[PDB]
Amino acid sequence: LDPISAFTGDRLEVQSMLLRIVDFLKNRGITGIFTHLL
């Protein structure tokens, strides 16, 4: 995901969205790379 920063911003909304993405990927056992500029 290059970059997660572009999603801006509403603090709670961004926090929750990134949390959901990470949660789903980890429950499916997937490696995640997240570029920034939490």
Next chain:
Amino acid sequence: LDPISAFTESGDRLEVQSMLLRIVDFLKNRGITGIFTHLAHTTDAGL
């Protein structure tokens, strides 16, 4: 509690402070030790 900072990031300023106050009050009233972890990234002094 690893970490309490997550609610602070979530939002609800006064409600987060009050929730942490009540957690600490209950644990100390029950004589339970309470370790609370925090991330430094301005309202870390009041804690």
